[PDB]
Write a protein that binds this ligand. Structure first.
Ligand code: CLA
Ligand code: CLA
Ligand code: CLA
Ligand code: CLA
Ligand SMILES: CC(C)=CCC/C(C)=C/CC/C(C)=C/CC/C(C)=C/CC/C(C)=C/CC/C(C)=C/CC/C(C)=C/CC/C(C)=C/CC/C(C)=C/CC1=CC(=O)C(C)=C(C)C1=O
Ligand SMILES: CC(C)=CCC/C(C)=C\CC/C(C)=C\CC/C(C)=C\CC/C(C)=C\CC/C(C)=C\CC/C(C)=C\CC/C(C)=C\CC/C(C)=C\CC1=CC(=O)C(C)=C(C)C1=O
Ligand SMILES: CCCCCCCCCCCCCCCCCC(=O)OC[C@H](CO[C@@H]1O[C@H](CO)[C@H](O)[C@H](O)[C@H]1O)OC(=O)CCCCCCCCCCCCCCCCC
Ligand SMILES: CCCCCCCCCCCCCCCCCC(=O)OC[C@H](CO[C@@H]1O[C@H](CO)[C@H](O)[C@H](O)[C@H]1O)OC(=O)CCCCCCCCCCCCCCCCC
Ligand SMILES: CCCCCCCCCCCCCCCCCC(=O)OC[C@H](CO[C@@H]1O[C@H](CO)[C@H](O)[C@H](O)[C@H]1O)OC(=O)CCCCCCCCCCCCCCCCC
Ligand SMILES: CCCCCCCCCCCCCCCC(=O)OC[C@H](CO[C@@H]1O[C@H](CS(=O)(=O)O)[C@@H](O)[C@H](O)[C@H]1O)OC(=O)CCCCCCCCCCCCCCC
Ligand SMILES: CCCCCCCCCCCCCCCC(=O)OC[C@H](COP(=O)(O)OC[C@@H](O)CO)OC(=O)CCCCCCCCCCCCCCC
Ligand SMILES: [Ca+2]
Ligand SMILES: [Cl-]
Lengths: 335, 102, 51, 176, 153, 97, 137, 243, 51, 51
């Protein structure tokens, strides 16, 4: 034995593994297995959770009357707030499942692993001699999960205010958010949808332009895909014919001819846009909300002349006035 | 409400939890409502009301001082809630109070 | 009046014949309460096999 | 004027709960991923064709060799994600399909919302919620949010209906 | 009767859902007979009118106004400060022609029940047993044909 | 049979005048000089068998008794309803602006 | 549709006599109302006690009457409860308590008249909005 | 004595004070000097839920249950006069205090049984002729158990008693007779029995201690289903003073 | 009160719009009796297409 | 009760059918309680027995 530990480190770091369990992986792989296994069990058999700390259990598991679309893993109690609630902090599991214990076990392990997943997306790139930064693109979707699962709860003072782990549970997070923060009227969110819409747009743009300008090497009755072999030397499409068409669609200088400048833009746009959307949720986690143009334009006498901004406010009040029915005892919603 | 003749100690809210005062997960007496999540707050104005078990029902019942009532009023009407364009309050509030907590 | 064999249970009996007669949720085949089956409860057995 | 269109569809059509809208977002969100991921994959798997750091100038506008190591990219993802492309022709067609199919689905959903043939409720859920007052899902919660949206918006959002909703008829939780 | 039937929102194709399968009868039930026209009045004898349900609304509130559109009565959410509850207004309901023809009802619950029904237009008597209906509106063939073809196109 | 005691209460004296035995304290804000001091006394001083019994609250200054006499026409009295009195709901029934 | 002097004519005292404010006083009041009231009295309500609003009618049934310049002004100097049977200057901004409520220090009799005038002019313009809360927003 | 910080997070705050093994004396009652209880306190130890004997009435017993909520059970700050009676007995009459705590316990099946553990309007009494309070000087009396949820509470579909919806608005044209019970909210009010039996006296400082046992009904959920019978065993501590 | 469009009928209306309004069993869409639809009854049309 | 229950043909495995699926409870129903032993007599007081 060349030295056990020396070998161990050579295996872990080995680039000959089907799946690159890295150094970050050593933390990732266990944390992600705990999160997934706990989730799957929760989502299927977990019992009702008193999310709002007002003894009014919300069942979100299949076996307890839910389906895929409605079902979810409910956030820890509001009675717990930001307190750490590990299994060994409960008199029993029965108490732990009632106070939304699983939620924390899941969010913490996931966020942890999902971070190492980024750390790994660097490591392998290092071990393979390729440039880094790929992990920096993945920093945007991660920074969102963080914003939605940890930053917002820290800011709002409770994990019960974090986004639930489910379809409908997510829609709840949105509808309520909008009511309390008016996100649609916030610059960061708008940049977010710009990045996402734009992304999908450009994704279609590139995708189409390229596939449409492929050099013919296929039969009339043979998949146009076969005209490419894994491990080619030259390109499989006429990037000069591509630019030729797109340059005429709009106008020459408003078109890419440099594949490298194209692909940077292709990556830069969404990542930057999503970065801001993540900063939006993380900023509005401290109650710095969207623009409030309520009763702005008023007439010569003082009457209030409504704008679409006001019609939005009514829709918002409805959400405000109806969310968490029995949870409020006082006039102002400061939590 | 206490000045209106209500017995804060035994007041039962909609959920049956305690309109004004309830217990934290570890037994301490804290403020009720959604405010149960901030039972870790400590502050000059509020401490003299705290006992060895949390908020003392006797001090709360007759040791509340005026400077505290207006302190509570002040801070209540100056929570760190506001909009980008600096309009203090909830996203559904009306323009008038130009403010956003530092 | 309503034991496992009335509820079309087929695997549940074979688990009791050798010891497992309780659930992590508190109940037990014999009808007792407060019992602590430990890990080897019907859930436990079911868990084990899946793994 | 478009944000209220969104809020309306939630409140009145419960649009977010619609299978077609979901596919919609799955396409746009998933399409904005392919965009980002492919872009980054390319910029960080590039061959060195220049002596500068700013590798942008180092590009051959007149084809020839692949400007990035398609073979390296494949191995990368094949080890970090488990799955990875290996046919640029397919990878690029995929990028067309995903966001275009998504938008098409989101369209059909609305074409149904025209006739108000929405995906508002789950009957099995409502029936249990009626008989049993302790059954509560994140779904039931949402519907109440809709009720509030409709009741508080309808007046100034649909003027031609001359709506008048007395304060006492207005649905509201406690304190708020 | 036929004429009255068309004046019922439960036959409006704009009501319904995408996965609310089957005939319209699995919804409100098989129509049996017309209970009759419901006229609502309050202590002063004034005749009130039930604000109908716009197709847009899945659920709608019960509000009663006079000829001039002044709100005279309603069914309150928060009773704490209700000014127009059917109780405080002595609201009553009378029927003309049909099953309930010539009859009058004055006990608040029963009055509110029919008021809750007037919202949909002419009040009818359904057989919910047979098809095991759920009481949730479904769209007419007109609606389905329209949806299918608008999509295909 | 099953009935909503509150919706039924609105068909009686309560719902037409300030119920000295049920109606929440804030209701006294609709008449001159009754709110702070008197409304507290009225509510705090348990139920009444008849409107006039309010005039008998121990301590009432001669002026207070005067004021009360003036507003008697705005009061009534009905059986104490638990749903309306429990939880201290007469000092705060969860309603604001 | 304008703020005519017809609208700026509000009751001065209890004995029917009125006063007419000017577009300068109004705006000035509105500004002062924001400076020392909005905090708790935004839009005619009262955040730290929603039971009492600034509706003219509410101020009319107050004790003493506070639905006129004279009334409101006195209040801003020596505040009382709705029945007036108790002075509350210790937990409510006022002139006799500017040491406790600094914002009230600058405020001079000129300012007090404007603020008072604002309170009586707003409902004239906004109507139902002024009194009610979010329901009317 | 320990400050707040010396208790926070320890759970100690949900524990009625205790007397040492020594303090087993006796406190005197002047019978011509009014007395009151400066602080009664009740700490639960066990919550037993009598099980429904199914159709086959076979006599039912109480069964233990797991406390699904946490250490929020204790009643504290109770106070009132401990008037001396003609026959020389003592009756405590509560005025105010943290006289109730919503508790929720699970059972064998997995069923959560929420109750409003309380002693509101307590009226405990003792044996006739009780010049001095010795160890075990039984206190017995009734109290009131108000509805678990108050008037304003709304069910998942918006329906409520003092507020909320009139019916199942999700099923616009369904028969209503079947849904009756779940649409019409009822506010339950009942009586309870409790007995405070002393174990430790301390005539010196006038503070008795012991154990209690009380029975009451659980939440009926605005009258949607039947309430369960509950028995609650724990300990108590009282501070008697002349005043 | 219970016409084809309440019973989720989709093909039956298109058959009436052009004439076929009766059944070999005797009844008819308009609600008449004793009518003789001949061969071209709903059954007939259905028969024809199958062939 | 348990003892009486075993003396009921509705627990005899020899009753049933090949396609009579499910638990024994989908048959006669969930047993709730023992109505009791039935003793039959005729006018003369004689006790009869059910074959
Ligand atoms: C994860 C969050 C999410 C996501 C990803 C989406 C995603 C989407 N939603 Mg959506 N939605 C959400 C949440 C989300 N939603 C929520 C919470 C709500 C509230 C219930 C809604 C409510 C909602 C509604 C009501 C609708 C959508 C629709 C859509 C889709 C179409 C958007 C589009 O591409 O416009 C593209 C816009 C066009 C019309 C394309 C033509 C425009 C031309 C080409 C532009 C010309 C520009 C010009 C040259 C420049 C001049 C401009 C000048 C100012 C410079 C898209 C799939 C829509 C859809 O489904 O329709 C089919 C739709 O109607 N959503
Ligand atoms: C009529 C079609 C239409 C158009 C033109 C727009 C346009 C716009 N929407 Mg939009 N939207 C539509 C339908 C449409 N929407 C529908 C049906 C829905 C669902 C109901 C939405 C929902 C929606 C949301 C939720 C949001 C927007 C937003 C926006 C703005 C930024 C979006 C963006 O970044 O896209 C990404 C696409 C690009 C990267 C293309 C950029 C092209 C722009 C338009 C400039 C064009 C150049 C211009 C013509 C000048 C050239 C002249 C020069 C050559 C001399 C933008 C003004 C956002 C916003 O409000 O931000 C302020 C936002 O948050 N939209
Ligand atoms: C052989 C072992 C076995 C046994 C003894 C049982 C026994 C039982 N199961 Mg069961 N089960 C088994 C295996 C078994 N299961 C397996 C492997 C599965 C997984 C699919 C299940 C899944 C299952 C479920 C989901 C349920 C039961 C239930 C039950 C109970 C009700 C009885 C029943 O429904 O009969 C039904 C018997 C039949 C319909 C007879 C089938 C005979 C077929 C038709 C013959 C096919 C002939 C063939 C085509 C000819 C071609 C040959 C030719 C070409 C030469 C019963 C105790 C039920 C229970 O829980 O009760 C409450 C219940 O819900 N079982
Ligand atoms: C398009 C023509 C059409 C129309 C308009 C109707 C209309 C109607 N039929 Mg019908 N039917 C049709 C064709 C049609 N049918 C055909 C071809 C058949 C043979 C199978 C039937 C068989 C049939 C039966 C057996 C019955 C009806 C009934 C009914 C009536 C009830 C409505 C219904 O149940 O909606 C249901 C609507 C749906 C559930 C919507 C389906 C939408 C799917 C889920 C979308 C799939 C999306 C896709 C997977 C996405 C993938 C794309 C992605 C990969 C890119 C209604 C009048 C019922 C009736 O008799 O009433 C009393 C009835 O019992 N029909
Ligand atoms: C216990 C239980 C039951 C758990 C339930 C848990 C739960 C609730 C889950 C529910 C899930 C659920 C049902 C979701 C519904 C959403 C869904 C199915 C929507 C419908 C989809 C649909 C048909 C709509 C049409 C829209 C459409 C086509 C969108 C598809 C989006 C799509 C699949 C995109 C894939 C994106 C993706 C991650 C691919 C990465 C590919 C890859 C590794 C590329 C990397 C890469 C880049 C390079 O550049 C190069 C060079 C190479 C080489 C390379 O490799
Ligand atoms: C004619 C006459 C009579 C005179 C009258 C003229 C007149 C009045 C006209 C006014 C028309 C009018 C109102 C304006 C139309 C709107 C308009 C300007 C269009 C918008 C164009 C615009 C500015 C957007 C460009 C967006 C943009 C940055 C490009 C996207 C590029 C992208 C990422 C594609 C991916 C990509 C690009 C490539 O380039 C190649 C190569 C490949 C491979 C590839 O993937
Ligand atoms: C740590 C590891 C984490 C595990 C990740 C699991 C990845 C899922 C793999 C799915 C199979 C992919 C596949 O079959 O295509 C395998 C192919 C790869 O094979 C293809 O083969 C040829 C095509 O003719 C070409 O050579 C292509 O370039 C490519 O090589 O992948 C694709 O080309 C499509 C890319 C999109 C992949 C799907 C993303 C996965 C999303 C899953 C969401 C569902 C979740 C449901 C939740 C319940
Ligand atoms: C991508 C584009 C997608 C666009 C979709 C466009 C669809 C247009 C709408 C068409 C409506 C017509 C539906 C016809 C079917 C129907 O009506 O049944 C409707 C059925 C039966 O409807 C029944 O009607 C009554 C009985 O006579 C009762 O009311 C019953 O309760 C029930 O509602 O309801 C369902 O089961 C809905 C499930 C449909 C899901 C599709 C499953 C796919 C199966 C594929 C099998 C392939 C085999 C090879
Ligand atoms: C040639 C040799 C053939 C010899 C056959 C030997 C079979 C021995 C008997 C085995 C009994 C065990 C049956 C197990 C299944 C069961 O119990 O379900 C029994 C099910 C469910 O039983 C249900 O039980 C209760 C619900 O918990 C209720 O009482 C329900 O009403 C219902 O009875 O009943 C059926 O549906 C019977 C249909 C079985 C027909 C088989 C269809 C084949 C499907 C093939 C799919 C292949 C997929 C790949
Ligand atoms: C509390 C601590 C618990 C500790 C648990 C006990 C230790 C782990 C036991 C693992 C048993 C399972 C074996 C799995 C085999 C395998 O993965 O492929 C076999 C390949 C080949 O391995 C190669 O296999 C070779 C042997 S052979 O090829 O398999 O014969 C071997 O020589 C070489 O070293 C090896 O790299 O494994 C790898 O490439 C190394 C990466 C392993 C990645 C682990 C899973 C990652 C999960 C990420 C999170 C996902 C979340 C959930 C999503 C669903
Ligand atoms: C406050 C607002 C913050 C804006 C941050 C903008 C960050 C730029 C976008 C990052 C996208 C990350 C995805 C990988 C994208 C990726 O890998 O591309 C990398 C690409 C540069 O590649 P090069 O080959 O030039 O890198 C070598 C040299 O840049 C030396 O580092 O990024 C740039 O063009 C830098 C532009 C800076 C201008 C500011
Ligand atoms: Ca039970
Ligand atoms: Cl909610």
């Amino acid at each position: 034995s060349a030295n056990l530990w020396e070998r161990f480190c050579n295996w872990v770091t080995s680039t000959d593994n089907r799946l690159y369990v890295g150094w970050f992986g050593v933390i990732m792989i266990p944390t992600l297995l705990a999160a997934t296994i706990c989730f799957v069990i929760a989502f299927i058999a977990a019992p009702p959770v008193d999310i709002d700390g007002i003894r009014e259990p919300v069942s979100g598991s299949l076996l307890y009357g839910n389906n895929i679309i409605t079902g979810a893993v409910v956030p820890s109690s509001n009675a717990i707030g930001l307190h750490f609630y590990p299994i060994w902090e409960a008199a029993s599991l029965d108490e732990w499942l009632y106070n939304g214990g699983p939620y924390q076990l899941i969010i913490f392990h996931f966020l942890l692993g999902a971070s190492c997943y980024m750390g790994r997306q660097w490591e392998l790139s290092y071990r393979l001699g390729m440039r880094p930064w790929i992990c920096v693109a993945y920093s945007a979707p991660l920074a969102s999960a963080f914003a939605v699962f940890l930053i917002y709860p820290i800011g709002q003072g409770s994990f019960s205010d974090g986004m639930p782990l489910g379809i409908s549970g997510t829609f709840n997070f949105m509808i309520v958010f909008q009511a309390e923060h008016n996100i649609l009227m916030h610059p960061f969110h708008q940049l977010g949808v710009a990045g996402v819409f734009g992304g999908a747009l450009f994704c279609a743009m590139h995708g189409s332009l390229v596939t449409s300008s492929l050099i013919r090497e296929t039969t009339e009755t043979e998949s146009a895909n076969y005209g490419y072999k894994f491990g080619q030397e030259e390109e499989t499409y006429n990037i000069v014919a591509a630019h030729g068409y797109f340059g005429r669609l709009i106008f020459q200088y408003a078109s890419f001819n440099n594949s490298r400048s194209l692909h940077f833009f292709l990556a830069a746009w969404p990542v930057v846009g999503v970065w801001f959307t993540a900063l939006g949720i993380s900023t509005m986690a401290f109650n710095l909300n969207g623009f409030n143009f309520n009763h702005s334009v008023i007439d010569a006498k003082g009457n209030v002349i409504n704008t679409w901004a006001d019609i939005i406010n009514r829709a918002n009040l409805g959400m405000e006035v109806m969310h968490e029915r029995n949870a409020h005892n006082f006039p102002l919603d400061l939590a | 409400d206490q000045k209106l003749g209500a017995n804060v100690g035994s007041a039962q809210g909609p959920t049956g939890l305690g309109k004004y005062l309830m217990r934290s997960p570890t037994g301490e007496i804290i403020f009720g409502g959604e405010t149960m999540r901030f039972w870790d707050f400590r502050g000059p104005w509020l401490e003299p009301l705290r006992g060895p078990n949390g908020l003392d029902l006797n001090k709360i019942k007759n040791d509340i001082q005026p400077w505290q009532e207006r302190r509570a009023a002040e801070y209540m009407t100056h929570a760190p809630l506001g909009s980008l364009n600096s309009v203090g309050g909830v996203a559904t509030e009306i323009n008038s109070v130009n403010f956003v907590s530092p | 009046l309503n034991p496992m064999w009335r509820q079309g249970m087929f695997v549940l009996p074979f688990m009791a014949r050798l010891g497992v007669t309780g659930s992590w949720s508190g109940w037990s085949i014999t009808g007792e309460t407060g019992i602590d089956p430990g890990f080897w409860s019907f859930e436990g057995v079911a868990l084990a096999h899946i793994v | 004027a478009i944000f209220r269109f969104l809020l309306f569809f939630q409140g009145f059509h419960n649009w977010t709960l619609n299978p077609f809208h979901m596919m919609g977002v799955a396409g746009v969100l998933g399409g904005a991923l392919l965009c980002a991921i492919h872009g980054a994959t390319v910029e960080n798997t590039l061959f060195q064709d220049g002596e500068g750091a700013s590798t942008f100038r180092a590009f051959n506008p007149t084809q020839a060799e692949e400007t990035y190591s398609m073979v390296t990219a494949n191995r990368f993802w094949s080890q970090i994600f488990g799955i990875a492309f290996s046919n640029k022709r397919w990878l690029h067609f995929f990028m067309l399909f995903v966001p275009v199919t998504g938008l098409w689905m989101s369209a059909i959903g609305v074409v149904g919302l025209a006739l108000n043939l929405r995906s508002y409720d789950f009957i099995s859920q409502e029936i249990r919620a009626a008989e049993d007052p302790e059954f509560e899902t994140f779904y039931t919660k949402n519907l109440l949010l809709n009720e509030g949206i409709r009741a508080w918006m309808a007046p100034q959002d649909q003027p031609h209906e001359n709506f008048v909703f007395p304060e006492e008829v207005l649905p509201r939780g406690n304190a708020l | 009767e036929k004429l009255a039937f068309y004046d019922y929102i439960g036959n409006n194709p704009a009501k319904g859902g995408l996965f609310r399968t089957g005939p319209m009868n699995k919804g409100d039930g098989i129509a049996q007979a017309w209970k009759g026209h419901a006229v609502f009045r309050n202590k002063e004898g004034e005749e009130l009118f039930v604000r109908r349900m716009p197709a847009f609304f899945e659920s709608f509130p019960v509000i009663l106004t006079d000829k001039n559109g002044v709100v005279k009565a309603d069914i309150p959410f928060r009773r704490a400060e209700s000014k127009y509850s059917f109780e405080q207004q002595g609201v009553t309901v009378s029927f003309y022609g049909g099953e309930l023809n010539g009859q009058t009802f004055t006990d608040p619950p029963t009055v509110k029940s029919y008021a809750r029904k007037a919202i949909f237009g002419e009040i009818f008597e359904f057989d919910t047993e047979t098809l095991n209906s759920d009481g949730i509106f479904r769209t007419s063939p007109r609606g389905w044909f329209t949806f299918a073809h608008a999509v295909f196109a | 049979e099953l009935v909503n005691v509150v919706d039924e209460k609105l068909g009686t004296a309560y719902g037409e005048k300030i119920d000295l035995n049920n109606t929440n304290i804030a209701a006294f804000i609709q008449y001159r000089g009754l709110y702070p001091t008197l409304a507290k006394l009225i509510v705090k001083n348990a139920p009444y068998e008849s409107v006039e019994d309010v005039l008998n609250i121990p301590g009432l200054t001669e002026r207070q008794k005067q004021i009360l006499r003036e507003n008697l026409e705005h009061f009534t009295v009905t059986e104490v309803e638990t749903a309306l009195v429990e939880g201290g709901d007469r000092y705060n029934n969860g309603l604001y602006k | 549709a304008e703020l005519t002097p017809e609208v700026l004519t509000v009751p001065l005292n209890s004995e029917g006599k009125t006063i007419t404010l000017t577009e300068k006083q109004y705006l000035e009041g509105k500004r002062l109302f924001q400076y020392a009231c909005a905090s708790c009295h935004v839009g005619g309500i009262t955040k730290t006690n929603p039971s009492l609003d600034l509706r003219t009618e509410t101020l009319a049934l107050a004790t003493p009457p506070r639905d006129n310049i004279e009334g409101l002004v006195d209040y801003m100097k020596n505040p009382t409860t709705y029945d007036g049977e108790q002075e509350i200057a210790e937990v409510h901004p006022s002139l006799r308590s500017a040491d406790i409520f600094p914002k009230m220090r600058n405020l001079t009799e000129k300012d007090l008249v404007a603020i008072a005038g604002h309170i009586l002019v707003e409902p004239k313009i906004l109507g139902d909005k002024w009194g009610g809360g979010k329901v009317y927003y | 004595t320990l400050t707040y910080d010396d208790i926070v997070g320890t759970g100690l705050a949900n524990k009625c004070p205790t007397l040492d093994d020594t303090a087993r004396g006796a406190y005197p009652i002047d019978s011509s000097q009014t007395y009151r209880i400066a602080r009664l306190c009740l700490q639960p130890t066990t919550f037993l839920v009598k099980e429904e004997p199914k159709n086959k009435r076979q006599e039912a017993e109480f069964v233990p249950t797991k406390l699904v909520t946490r250490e929020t059970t204790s009643l504290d700050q109770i106070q009132g006069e401990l008037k001396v009676n003609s026959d020389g007995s003592l009756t405590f009459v509560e005025e105010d205090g943290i006289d109730f705590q919503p508790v929720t316990v699970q059972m064998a099946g997995g069923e959560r049984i929420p109750l409003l553990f309380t002693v509101k309007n307590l009226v405990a009494s003792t044996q006739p002729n009780v010049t001095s309070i010795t160890t075990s000087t039984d206190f017995k009396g009734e109290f009131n158990v108000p509805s678990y949820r108050t008037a304003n509470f709304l069910d998942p579909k918006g329906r409520g008693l003092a507020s909320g919806y009139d019916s199942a608005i999700a099923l616009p044209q369904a028969k209503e007779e079947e849904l009756a019970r779940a649409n019409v909210k009822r506010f339950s009010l009942t009586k309870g029995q409790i007995s405070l039996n002393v174990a430790k006296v301390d005539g010196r400082t006038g503070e008795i201690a012991g154990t209690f046992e009380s029975e009451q009904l659980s939440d009926d959920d605005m009258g949607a289903h039947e309430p369960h019978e509950v028995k609650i065993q724990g300990v108590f501590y009282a501070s008697i003073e002349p005043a």
